[PDB]
Design an enzyme around this catalytic site. Sequence first.
Site, mmCIF file in Angstrom:
data_model
loop_
_atom_site.group_PDB
_atom_site.id
_atom_site.type_symbol
_atom_site.label_atom_id
_atom_site.label_comp_id
_atom_site.label_asym_id
_atom_site.label_seq_id
_atom_site.Cartn_x
_atom_site.Cartn_y
_atom_site.Cartn_z
ATOM 1 C CG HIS A 41 -6.835 33.846 1.354
ATOM 2 N ND1 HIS A 41 -6.031 32.922 2.571
ATOM 3 C CD2 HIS A 41 -7.956 34.620 1.347
ATOM 4 C CE1 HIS A 41 -7.010 33.516 3.250
ATOM 5 N NE2 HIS A 41 -7.842 33.953 2.811
ATOM 6 N N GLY A 143 -13.165 37.788 6.907
ATOM 7 C CA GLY A 143 -12.585 38.845 7.208
ATOM 8 C C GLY A 143 -12.118 38.873 7.923
ATOM 9 C CB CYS A 145 -7.858 36.152 6.803
ATOM 10 S SG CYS A 145 -9.080 34.259 6.078
#
Lengths: 305, 305
Positions: A41, A143, A145
């Site tokens: 993503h 942030g 991820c």
Amino acid sequence: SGFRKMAFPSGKVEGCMVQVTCGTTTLNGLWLDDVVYCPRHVICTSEDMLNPNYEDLLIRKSNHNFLVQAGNVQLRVIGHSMQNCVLKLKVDTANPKTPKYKFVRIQPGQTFSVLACYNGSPSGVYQCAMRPNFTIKGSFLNGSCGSVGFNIDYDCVSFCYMHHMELPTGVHAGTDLEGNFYGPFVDRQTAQAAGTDTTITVNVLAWLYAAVINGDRWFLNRFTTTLNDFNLVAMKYNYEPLTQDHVDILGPLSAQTGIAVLDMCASLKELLQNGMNGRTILGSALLEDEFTPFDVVRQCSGVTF
Amino acid sequence: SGFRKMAFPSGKVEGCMVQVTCGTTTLNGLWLDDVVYCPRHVICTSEDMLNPNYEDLLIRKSNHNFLVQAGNVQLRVIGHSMQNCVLKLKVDTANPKTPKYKFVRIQPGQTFSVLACYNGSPSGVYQCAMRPNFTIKGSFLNGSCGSVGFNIDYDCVSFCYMHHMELPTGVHAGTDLEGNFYGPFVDRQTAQAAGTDTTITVNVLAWLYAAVINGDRWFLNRFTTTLNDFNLVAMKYNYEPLTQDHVDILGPLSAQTGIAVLDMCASLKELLQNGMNGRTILGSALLEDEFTPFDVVRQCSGVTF
């Protein structure tokens, strides 16, 4: 002596963290050999995340749309592919700091260390458990991820987790390093039920053994129980059913302490039915379930890497 | 979101750990530039530790009596000196992995990360606080002496602690990197009173702010208090007296949450007098005092290194 919730030394993983940017979205990637792994993503805007078609969104991306930066080094992307929920970015340089590593898919109730990262830079490290419902209760801001979870065996890093999602309930969901989610979750910004969590019974028992080894003995009672009787209590208090496999894993701790597993189960049963009466065990006022039996043996023996 | 007891990434410190052997005694050393720092009781046998004369014991040692090994590298010792309770071993090679670093002496109530090591090899990392009585509640087995505690600011490691002793009570004592003990302790195997510990009040308040930020609000009450009234309660429950300096440090958290510090003090007063009634705050059934106000801001903001 003393007993702490201890993470693995993070150095071998720090050397693998990079920053991945695609359009307006920046998150963390994991650079091993000449492949960078990151959540797919990264190719989504905030609006894409409500209902993304990843195949269609990825088709609109070329190699030069992925900016991969390792500290100050800009990595050249020469291929991209999607594997389940992770993107694999082939780069033209092998990470010179690549450790010996494995990709593993852990079982619920197992523990690992998380290296929380932002913009490719490590912020901290902590130990957690994969819940029986395949969430983790981490510390993940916007942030984070692409931050990874890992175990270390001597000189080998076993990567088991990559962070992808914060559920609306505040708990966290992610994948193995092949991109398969733990649990029923999907990388879409929507309501997602995690389902009933339970307490990791074999971990609680391991921690009770750690407490006895360190001199906390007040909870030791004069009762015993049976596996079937204990599980009647476990079901009532939303504890995982204990099996003989679990009894076997606790063997070495039972032998060190001279306390039969079913005797320890009887002490835990009394703790569940009567509470802790304002007392503490190893500095905790609740029953701790984030130490595996292997974790307890490691810490009480001083295993290094 | 989520809130975890997070240690600093340990990589910069892992590269500085070495093993120091003198006679039968092996422990950990810290290799920075061309100096290795380690506890001076590396020169003691078990029998020496009951009543050691370190000056006399060190006179019987020469440079070639100190074996310093960095992984597989054998370091050549070209000088030795004793500074307070630490030995400084001058070696003929500068550690190529030396980070930017400072030696700092921290204040009671401040937090740091410990890299637990054995035989010069890192075993794990965890965050802890220097207690008001200058002990720490760590996880230290035989051979962990010389393990260090540190903070990181961007790219600079501030070393604040070196482990020396487990007291008969099971708590831990050590020095700054100039070898001066924290607290009244000495490097001798004898009974040593630590004296009354207290709870770090400003840290508890910071953690209550962290809880509100993460959505745990049940403890917020309809009362306020005064600094003097709150401290009457603090003295009764063995909490550190709160000063205006502490109120000032909590300023940014008060501004983010819109909760005046004295209002939060009133909620904490009610928690102290009435307990927590079987509830939890941020997953804890007791009041947590191992997060400084700076720790809370760091974690809630995602500061990296």
